[PDB]
From a paper:
In this study, we present a novel AraC-family transcription factor, [name] (PA2588), that controls numerous virulence factors via directly regulating the quorum sensing Pseudomonas quinolone signal (PQS) system. In this study, we showed that the new QS regulator [name] (we named PA2588 in this study) directly activated PqsH, the PQS synthase. Like VqsM, [name] belongs to the AraC-family transcriptional regulators, which control a variety of cellular processes in bacteria, including carbon metabolism, stress responses, and virulence. [name] is a substrate of ATP-dependent ClpAP protease.
The structure belongs to P41212 space group, and it contains one PaCdpR protein molecule in the asymmetric unit. The overall structure of PaCdpR can be divided into three regions, i.e., NTR (aa 5–203), connector region (CR, aa 204–228), and C-terminal HTH domain (aa 229–329). The NTR is of PaCdpR that is of α/β fold in nature; it is composed of ten α-helices (α1 to α10) and five β-strands (β1 to β5). Four helices, α9, α10, α6, and α7 were packed against the β-sheet at the edge in an anti-clockwise direction, while α8 (the longest helices) crossed the β-sheet in the middle and formed extensive hydrophobic interactions with the three central strands (β2, β5, and β3). Though both [name] NTR and EcAraC NTD are of α/β fold in nature, their overall folds are different from each other. Altogether, these data indicate that [name] NTR has a novel fold among AraC family, and its functions need to be further investigated. Although the overall folds are similar, structural comparison revealed that the detailed conformation of [name] HTH is different from other AraC proteins. [name] HTH contains seven α helices (α13–α19), which can be further divided into two subdomains, i.e., HTH1 (aa 229–271) and HTH2 (aa 291–329). The largest difference occurs at the HTH1 motif, especially the helix α13. Instead, [name] HTH1 and HTH2 mainly interact with each other through the backbone of loop B (aa 303–304) and the side chain of Tyr245 from loop A. This interaction was further enhanced by Arg281 and Arg284 of helice α16, which connects HTH1 and HTH2 and Tyr305 of loop B, via H-bonding and stacking.
Author numbering: 5 to 28, 39 to 329
């Protein structure tokens, strides 16, 4: 029983309301087609693209908003699991040796649509993607360049709209960004909301984003880092990643690790700052690192470094 919520339905109808137009698997798919095929100019696609709000992308959009950096937001975008994914064949992010990054949007074919409708369509996706970039990823900096699909036409109205150089060539859409943007902070970053929001995504979304973010080890490390002083069971972690414990163990084993080793890496790292703090007793360091008593911590710490905790604190 596959039932999807139709997030695109409202913004489509908002466009129709604004333009005073009356309309005759998801209901939005047929409506979108009708709007596109009845467009009187490809430029109208730019207006329709404006009607997609970040909130229209649902919990995936919340993850984007709360991501730590622009680079991390682009990892989520690369999963191709946002609104237009049926119409997008793939999204690539390519580093250049030219201090720029290309975000390439590859579009699915529309062989039954005429050439004007296909240009209209590309403008909708470009305008909507631009809105996301603008509100969230650009901030102060600007787009270097925008490439839209080849046609015989003037670029003026597009440079008017996007306020950056634009040209027509090839297939799909490419946004060129300054490379330094990737490490820039997202203004609404919130790592707790980000991790929580990923966990609310679908099984398929979770598998894909885990891959794009660097794999299961990295995913678990990021999750534990947000949980500043909690050390969850593998059961709880598997739940957050939308996988069974068995699957998680296996995928960790493929990356050549295991859950206990990942947990202890985070604990060891955290213990570095705790055993320098002169105000804490070893007892308090143990409790903070999730151990049930001091002796179990001492044995673990010994196992990590090969040195005793009190001797380490001095040296």
């Amino acid at each position: 029983e596959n039932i999807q919520y139709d997030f695109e339905w409202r913004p489509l109808n908002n466009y129709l309301a604004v333009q005073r137009i009356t309309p005759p698997r998801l209901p939005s798919e047929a409506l979108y087609e009708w709007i596109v095929l009845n467009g009187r100019s490809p430029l109208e696609g730019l207006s329709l693209g404006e009607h997609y709000r970040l909130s229209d992308y649902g919990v995936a959009g919340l993850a984007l908003q709360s991501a730590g950096t622009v680079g991390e937001a682009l990892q989520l975008i690369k999963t191709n699991m946002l609104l237009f994914r049926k119409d997008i064949r793939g999204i690539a992010v390519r580093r250049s040796s030219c201090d720029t990054v290309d975000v390439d949007i590859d579009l699915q074919d529309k062989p039954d649509w005429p050439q004007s409708a296909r240009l209209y369509h590309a403008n909708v996706l470009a305008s909507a993607a631009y809105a996301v970039f603008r509100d969230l990823l650009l901030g102060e900096l600007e787009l270097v360049r925008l490439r839209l699909p080849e046609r015989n036409g003037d670029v003026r109205a597009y440079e008017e709209y996007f306020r950056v150089p634009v040209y027509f060539a090839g297939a799909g859409i490419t946004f060129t960004l300054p490379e330094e943007l990737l490490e820039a902070e997202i203004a609404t970053a919130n790592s707790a909301v980000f991790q929580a929001s990923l966990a609310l995504g679908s099984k398929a979304f979770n598998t894909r984003v885990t891959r794009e973010m660097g794999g299961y080890r990295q995913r678990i490390v990021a999750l534990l880092e947000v949980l500043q002083d909690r050390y969850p069971s593998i059961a709880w972690v598997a739940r957050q990643l939308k996988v069974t414990e068995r699957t998680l163990r296996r995928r960790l084993a493929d990356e050549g690790t295991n859950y206990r080793e990942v947990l202890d890496l985070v604990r060891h790292d955290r213990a570095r700052q705790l055993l320098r703090d002169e105000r804490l007793r070893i007892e308090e360091v143990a409790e903070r690192l999730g151990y049930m008593d001091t002796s179990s911590f001492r044995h673990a710490f010994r196992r990590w470094t090969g040195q005793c905790a009190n001797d380490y604190r001095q040296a």
